[PDB]
């Protein structure tokens, strides 16, 4: 919907009631799943995705017909209404927590104006399209805004796009040419102009429009991205950016890549749905048996029912069989258990709570624990592989230091990395103590280097523990030791690192004034911040060029010219007239960009040593840079400047002429040295990645940042390695290539790569790849940018692509778009039958997060655009190991055991009832006194199984991090199979047989077994006789199946059994019951009661006890052996170390 | 200061005290040992118990069917089930004579003619007190859905409820007057309708030639035969005797209705009615009729007069009577002993096999990193 905007008369072609066309969304943002006005129908339809609720609602409307057993009002209609209401209450509370953080975000302030005559503070929601807006430094941007002016002239603002695109540098944006002159806050009400725009597009780097600035008659200024401040971009290096809001709501490219928090479901719910259907099938089969047998027995003129009972429930045996069928369906309702869904909701909410309250995942710097936002999915985290990950936000803190350098063929690093620490301590060498002694050597070298710097000129700007380039050899080489010429080399190098920059310097008064360096990228910021920590500190450009404070004495340099950085240049230069009279050109950039611009046939050993050292550094994960110099000539400089400003005057094709003239001066050079800046990871990220990869998970880093920084971070995190072939799928978006040739080139690359993996995507090697769970060949990585990714994700290549990505051990996407992130996640999620986690920190990440099975956000303080739409909200990447390894396999095993024991429980109950029906001509008569059935699943047995589900843990909080291989059992989904379900149901049927036919034998195969001799063979006394041992049996089986018998579990078992005894003994002491008038004194005080009470639980729990003990001894598990190990010892070290 | 710090309790952090229930073979051997011991002990106990009691069951449907009219013919062996330890005494069970007779009896006014059976059964040894006397009804289903909810509670409690509430209650077909009038039946259900109608006349111990007088009536009572709570449930009626009538089947007993000579029976004292109106569970139930707590029945050729008022072969059912003597366990039930012995025996054999396969045979030393399934 291509729109238009007017600023001070509307277009009469859209009149009153015709102008509201182009209806623009409200600037509010809804990540909540439910609105107040439409929460009820949406939530009801969501809860009914569980199929059993259909059966329960039908069974509730079926008891209204007053012909079957139980009357409708309370007994059968209270449970459904209460369950639906408590489920809706839980979901509404959860959605309201999401909504309260949503409305906290929506009230963020923005200086608004087109009606206010001043930029008064307002909120985001109050931003109608076409309203002026002022923005200040580091302000999150409310909506997609076109620039109109800014603080400094020439229109240059900086945007940190790290939230939308993983690029770190402050991208420059230009105010449009005519209109920059509105500096004031109220000189906008005479700014009469018109905006033309285009329909909203999710492509980030494609946008176009126009302006009509009304002696001026007609203007037109196309506006690419260079006039578009996006929404997640942070405004920097500018005091105010008086923009205008063009997009709002979900028109913005940040929001156009998400839905509205598509509600996820826990992937156990679906297999549980199939199991519910199978149980309903067996329910109908048994009810049909009941109906046929009841009709057959009721259509006889020889049974004692014809004489003594004048009856039929209908004037036919067929009709009475039909009535008995439906009545039995009422009685055997618990084959499809009603208490399953409320029990699972209660267990999942308690597990989400326990996740929320774990200090082992509490991050101090942001003051929040691992707050879960979807309490349904707490078990899926126990099955996932394919942890897709952002790079710029999650992995790397995005603080860039200056570690090493190689100048005049001499390296100065003296540095150590936790990455290398893990890489070495994984093998047999350098296990534990070497880390401590090496860090001690680094601390010693640091203090000695600071001492050496102090022996030089006094540096007030230098601050200990504010420096990372620690090199004592550098200090002694700059002092003069080891050579009179090497001193000159290092001095000139550190002077070059203080000359080629463009950083702005600001002094912070007070204690010895630490100077701050505002740059265009943290790269040159780290460069200069180290170029002040070794003398040569920098000052402002005081009307000439830079001022360098070299060794306590100031030096004023006039800067002749500067050629700024670019994405295509890959290098940046400056010519300066040094105080020694001669002018000098410095040029710093990529390693492979300067090696091309070098005077050939010189410094062979120097250049080859620098090459090998930069190879070492780039393998260690550092982002290398080369600096080169050339002694320019005065006449050469002025003639190059005349060519330069001539190319500047040519208005058409100007930039290409400037790039052409700027390439005639940077050819002959020489290599001063090579720096090595490090983009810092987070803490424990290499260890987290090692641990996860040992568990079975495969990690695909897919950033939106450049292709070589991705490989750098893949080397740091130890994803990549030095023994790894590289697969770079590339279709160079060759200019104007025929599109189909794109697909043909991509197909040939895919075909040769699959070949060499010794296969191809023939669709037969996919059904054999839907059933394989093995760590792939560990010597392969796949680097693929967005373009090649765009073309391999279209029709059929996808399949081939999948197989490719399944064989290579690592994957590193690059410059990938949010939509393409989601497309890769969906390709691995749907093309395979596998679970999927996505951890993120931004907009691209919100698209990746909602499409994955489990969405994890990082609270990276960049505006929680990807925290308000995630499953979980972690603070750091290192807590992901705690989450997935502890609260994942735990939760998954817990839910599996809960639902298995639960099916067993309801099976034994209803099949005991069914056997009794067998003994009464299938005319459905309760044996359980119409209150045992009412209170059984509620009081006597619910708490033991819910506790087994909520607070059971197999190994430990630390033995699980110590042995991650156990997580493999959750990868292949081996704890909730379809043979545990059937084995538990067969167990339930057997135990029902035994737990009914033992007490029946005891008290029915003999005349009144009651000691003093009286009627205890009654229909209800036998009910108590088989309903007390049944409760003890069910609670014993729920206890025998657990691993950690603790305070609460045993307490709840004891209270449930004592509570059935107490409830009987209390309810049968009044006349209100009249069937149980005094059941306690004449059932308890019998001896057959206690004999059955001690024999049926053993006779029911003995087969699985035997199976369990043998299947622990003769055949083990992995968790079995890890618990047999961690029992004695072998893990007390980790425990004692962690607790203190 | 950080306020969102999750409380470092020992419950929130899942650190509660606990016992990791590892199943090492020093824990399961003791479990199976103690289970085998306790269950073999209780099995021996309950077997001795179910062998310390002794009883005799006699079936009498062929009384009305095929018993003779004047001579004491013998009973076929498929009717006598006698569990008596001291076998081969001067008397031996499995030898009982029986004879039927149509007899003109009186009840209130009209002297109706019923049909009687007379059974001469010999018990060979004494049985010490609390000798009970049950009747036994095969193929009689009290446990039907419509049957077990068919009575009024307040009426049995003793009340004149109404002519409307009783009229539409769960005792549908039998709650109003069968004849023309609109009287209301006193016990309005079909559970009180079908009460057992036979009548047992107490064992007249024939002359054992010790006290050679012909009659030795072992006087067994039919009072204090149910739980006192039942007596707290029932009560004499408040009906005016005007609007109540036996429902359809007490007619051959109240051949004129409830009147000043045949009055409505008070239920707090009619204990056989209290035994009947507590619904049995199986179709082959027993129910208590008489007892005696204070004197031992001696070995003798006793004789019982069973008025066979209940026509039971009409639906292929069977009826019988038993004279069991009790113990602390109950009556003679051989199955608890055998079940306890079987459970104990299987626990013992599994204990033996486990101690063998975990101590003497290969023990599979604990926790070795060879079975870990990621080390193969
Ligand atoms: C005598 C035994 C006769 C029946 C043999 C069945 C063989 C089943 C083999 C099998 O697949 O076991 C599967 C399961 C037993 O696994 P587990 O480790 O104890 O589960 C504990 C759980 N992981 C936990 O610790 O939480 O199996 C079960 O969990 C239950 C099935 C066992 C047998 C059920 C009783 C049937 C007896 C019928 C005849 C009597
Ligand atoms: C929330 C409470 C909702 C209760 C609703 C309810 O009726 O209980 C239900 C579960 O409900 C539960 O299992 C909730 C258990 C929570 C813990 C309660 C423990 C108290 C001690 C139990 O219902 P039911 O016993 O399965 O009903 C069977 C009735 N029928 C046999 C005639 C088909
Ligand atoms: C009806 C009660 C609803 C309670 C809702 C609730 O707050 O549960 C809470 C406790 O939850 C419990 O302690 C158990 C509550 C009973 C089970 C859940 C209700 C039945 C479904 C669950 O807590 P949480 O959601 O894990 O905490 C979220 C943290 N946050 C507040 C920052 C988002
Ligand atoms: C002890 O209990 C048993 C069982 O309750 C009882 O046997 C029953 O006697 C009644 C009659 O008193 C029988 O009911 C009759 O059945 C026949 C055949 O179906 C019907 O034809 C009869 O209806 C006629 O007679 C009715 C009464 O006069 C009239 O109202 C009606 O209009 C018809 O003319 C009547 O329904 C019943 O079938 C038997 N039960 C069995 C199992 O045979 C026995 O009499 C009781 N004895 C004592 C002393 O209480
Ligand atoms: C309980 O339900 C029955 C069935 O509908 C009601 O039935 C009938 O009640 C009337 C009213 O008393 C009886 O009539 C009396 O009948 C005699 C005939 O013998 C007549 O001469 C009298 O004038 C008087 O009408 C009728 O016989 C009776 N029928 C049956 C089959 O029971 C009964 O009224 C209901 N109870 C109450 C309290 O309403
Ligand atoms: C058990 O039966 C014996 C049978 O003798 C009863 O003893 C007789 O009881 C009556 C009173 O009911 C006395 O008149 C007789 O003199 C007693 N006879 C003898 C020989 O003692 C005894 O009372 C009955 N007890 C119970 C509890 O029923
Ligand atoms: C018994 O009494 C009732 C009423 O008191 C009477 O109708 C009946 O005729 C009497 N019995 C005989 C045999 O007359
Ligand atoms: C048993 O004793 C009662 C009470 O004295 C008496 O009415 C009854 O006739 C006695 N039984 C026999 C068979 O005499
Ligand atoms: F902005 Be990112 F590292 F996807
Ligand atoms: Mg990010």
Residue numbers in the entry:
A (entry chain A): 83 to 90, 93 to 197, 321 to 421, 431 to 1356
B (entry chain B): 23 to 398
Sentences reproduced from the published study:
Type 4 P-type ATPases (P4-ATPases) are the phospholipid flippases which move specific lipids from the exoplasmic leaflet to the cytoplasmic leaflet. Dnf1p and Cdc50p from a thermophilic fungus, Chaetomium thermophilum (C. thermophilum) were cloned for structural studies (ctDnf1p-Cdc50p). The purified ctDnf1p-Cdc50p heterodimer showed phospholipid-dependent ATPase activity.
In the E2P structure, BeF3− is bound at the phosphorylation site D606, same as in the typical E2P structures of P-type ATPases. The A domain associates tightly with the N and P domains. In the E2P structure, the amphipathic helix of TM1 lies on the surface of the lipid membranes, extending to the brink of the nanodisc. In the E2P structure, a phospholipid molecule is found in a cavity formed by TMs 2, 4, and 6 in the exoplasmic half of the M domain (E2-site1). A PC molecule is modeled in the density, though it could be other kinds of phospholipids as the resolution is insufficient to distinguish the head groups. Therefore, the E2-site1 is likely for early recognition of the phospholipid substrates that have been picked up by the flippase, but are still located in the exoplasmic leaflet. The phosphate head group is at the water-membrane interface, clamped by R181 of TM2, F569 and Y572 of TM4, which are not conserved among P4-ATPase though.
